[PDB]
Amino acid sequence: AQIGPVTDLHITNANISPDGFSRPAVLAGGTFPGPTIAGNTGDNFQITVFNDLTDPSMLTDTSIHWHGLFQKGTNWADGPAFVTQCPIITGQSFDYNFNVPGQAGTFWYHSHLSTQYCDGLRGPFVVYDPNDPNASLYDVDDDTTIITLADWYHTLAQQEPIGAAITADATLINGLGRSFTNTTASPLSVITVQSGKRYRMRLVSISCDPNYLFSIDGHDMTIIEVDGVNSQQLTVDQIQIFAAQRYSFVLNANQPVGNYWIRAQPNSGGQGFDGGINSAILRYEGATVEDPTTTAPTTFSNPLVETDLHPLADLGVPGQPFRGGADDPLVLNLAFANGRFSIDGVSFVPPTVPVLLQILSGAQNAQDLLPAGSVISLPSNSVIEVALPAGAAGGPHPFHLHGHNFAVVQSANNATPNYVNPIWRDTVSIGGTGDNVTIRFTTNNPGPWFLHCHIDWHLEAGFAIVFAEDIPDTASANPVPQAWSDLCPAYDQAHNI
Ligand SMILES: *[C@@H]1O[C@H](CO)[C@@H](O[C@@H]2O[C@H](CO)[C@@H](O)[C@H](O)[C@H]2NC(C)=O)[C@H](O)[C@H]1NC(C)=O
Ligand SMILES: *[C@@H]1O[C@H](CO)[C@@H](O[C@@H]2O[C@H](CO)[C@@H](O)[C@H](O)[C@H]2NC(C)=O)[C@H](O)[C@H]1NC(C)=O
Numbered sequence: 448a449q450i451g452p453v454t455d456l457h458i459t460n461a462n463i464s465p466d467g468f469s470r471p472a473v474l475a476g477g478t479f480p481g482p483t484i485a486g487n488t489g490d491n492f493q494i495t496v497f498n499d500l501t502d503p504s505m506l507t508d509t510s511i512h513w514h515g516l517f518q519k520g521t522n523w524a525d526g527p528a529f530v531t532q533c534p535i536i537t538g539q540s541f542d543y544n545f546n547v548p549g550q551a552g553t554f555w556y557h558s559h560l561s562t563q564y565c566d567g568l569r570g571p572f573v574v575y576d577p578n579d580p581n582a583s584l585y586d587v588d589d590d591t592t593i594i595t596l597a598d599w600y601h602t603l604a605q606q607e608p609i610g611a612a613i614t615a616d617a618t619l620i621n622g623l624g625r626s627f628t629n630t631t632a633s634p635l636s637v638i639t640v641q642s643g644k645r646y647r648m649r650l651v652s653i654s655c656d657p658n659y660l661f662s663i664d665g666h667d668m669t670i671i672e673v674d675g676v677n678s679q680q681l682t683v684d685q686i687q688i689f690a691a692q693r694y695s696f697v698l699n700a701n702q703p704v705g706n707y708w709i710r711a712q713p714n715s716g717g718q719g720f721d722g723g724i725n726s727a728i729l730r731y732e733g734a735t736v737e738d739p740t741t742t743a744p745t746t747f748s749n750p751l752v753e754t755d756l757h758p759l760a761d762l763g764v765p766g767q768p769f770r771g772g773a774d775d776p777l778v779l780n781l782a783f784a785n786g787r788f789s790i791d792g793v794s795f796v797p798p799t800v801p802v803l804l805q806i807l808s809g810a811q812n813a814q815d816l817l818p819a820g821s822v823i824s825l826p827s828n829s830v831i832e833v834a835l836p837a838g839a840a841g842g843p844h845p846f847h848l849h850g851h852n853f854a855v856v857q858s859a860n861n862a863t864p865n866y867v868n869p870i871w872r873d874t875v876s877i878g879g880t881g882d883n884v885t886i887r888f889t890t891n892n893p894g895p896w897f898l899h900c901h902i903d904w905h906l907e908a909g910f911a912i913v914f915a916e917d918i919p920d921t922a923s924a925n926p927v928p929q930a931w932s933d934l935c936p937a938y939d940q941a942h943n944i
């Protein structure tokens with residue numbers, strides 16, 4: 448069952464074996480992935496998060512972010528540790544009480560403390576639209592049509608050795624999959640469809656790192672939503688999905704009754720499908736209970752290319768139709784050296800006092816804010832452009848902005864910008880060497896919004912800045928509850944800070 452929009456959510460430690468290998472984890476709702484949190488557009492979510500964690504090897508503090516939800520007037524509920532709150536300590540709870548006006552689509556939630564979401568605190572978050580303009584394109588849209596793609600590690604996140612390469616040990620589709628080494632024939636996920644029906648498949652990358660080449664043998668996929676933004680229909684036979692992105696696609700159960708492989712090939716870790724790694728099963732009702740015998744093509748006919756996507760609505764692009772054609776045009780210098788990432792020469796290290804609390808306490812320019820050089824002010828009611836030229840090691844980097852979606856004026860692997868009808872989204876691959884992926888948005892949401900690579904290992908290694916949007920109006924726009932004001936004193940006391 449789905450939970451919410453008003454629910455408790457307990458965060459616990461438990462052993463799990465999603466690929467046949469047992470390890471401890473950090474779980475929401477007792478499962479990996481966590482339960483789907485759901486409601487309708489405009490609803491009031493009240494998610495009372497109970498931190499019941501006791502195993503320090505995965506951190507006993509926590510904080511949860513609701514990825515892609517704008518949090519307008521509720522910046523304090525956004526979740527990034529040391530940006531909008533101090534963490535919740537063990538044995539305490541915290542009510543994330545917010546609204547989702549003007550949004551409907553496929554989102555997710557995850558820990559936003561250190562690399563803790565990699566240890567298991569990740570799940571889907573769906574905001575349905577009772578008047579969805581895409582409703583007539585499908586028959587079924589429910590918990591059974593959510594498809595999560597996850598990387599899974601045998602080594603605990605906090606225990607990844609300094610100086611060794613980090614790669615995953617399994618791809619999990621709907622929480623199940625097989626290990627790349629010492630593969631055992633552990634259970635695969637089954638997605639069941641009925642011949643003749645049409646399904647809104649909600650594809651969610653809950654990855655800490657790899658991008659996936661996602662496909663379904665024998666089928667094609669008609670994209671209708673990108674990171675919460677309705678799209679024109681775009682039929683593809685493969686989707687390269689980067690960490691934290693979402694798509695909805697229509698799956699027409701229009702092939703013979705049978706079993707078909709679902710494929711999710713990560714860019715690192717195990718290559719191929721030997722022993723059923725990187726795989727799940729699409730099973731038609733009435734098919735034999737057996738593995739598919741289908742193959743992929745050698746070359747896909749219609750892979751997703753981001754510039755092919757266009758909004759369903761007339762969203763346009765704010766500003767003027769040329770580089771720098773914005774009120775506040777930025778170009779970030781994104782770099783990596785010696786184990787640390789930097790943005791404009793500064794590697795992100797979380798501050799002691801959350802950025803929001805510093806602002807509420809009267810710090811009122813970005814040069815006043817800690818960490819020094821990591822907080823950039825944005826003016827209110829302005830068109831912002833951010834160019835994100837690639838080249839830093841470890842790419843392709845999926846950059847994500849909290850508090851906002853954005854027009855993708857320039858996409859990976861294509862030097863031509865689009866000032867007319869590009870897709871809007873919230874997480875974008877910045878591509879490869881020489882690319883100049885560029886985003887635009889307007890500043891109508893006062894508060895400090897994190898901008899970072901969503902490869903969690905890279906965030907931990909500093910690949911982030913905070914946009915302090917409309918510092919002057921942050922306090923008036925974001926009244927804070929007493930429980931939020933209590934977080935830092937409790938955290939600092941527990942940690943002898
Ligand atoms: C990416 O696009 C930005 C503009 O959006 C480019 O920025 C300009 O950079 C040059 C120096 O390289 C400066 O003289 C300009 O002031 C910048 N802004 C402009 C022209 O609008 C940037 O060079 C591009 N980067 C890459 C790698 O292509
Ligand atoms: C590279 O990106 C550009 C800009 O998004 C794409 O150009 C558009 O192509 C469509 C389809 O032919 C045309 O309707 C638009 O007028 C083009 N816009 C611009 C600004 O040129 C282009 O198709 C992309 N290249 C590839 C190979 O997909």
Ligand SMILES: [Cl-]
Nearest residue numbers: 514515849850
């Ligand atoms: Cl967000």
Ligand SMILES: [Cu+2]
Nearest residue numbers: 512514557691
């Ligand atoms: Cu996220």
Ligand SMILES: [Cu+2]
Nearest residue numbers: 514515848849
């Ligand atoms: Cu986010």
Ligand SMILES: [Cu+2]
Nearest residue numbers: 844900902905
């Ligand atoms: Cu990265």
Ligand SMILES: [Cu+2]
Nearest residue numbers: 527849897899
């Ligand atoms: Cu974030």
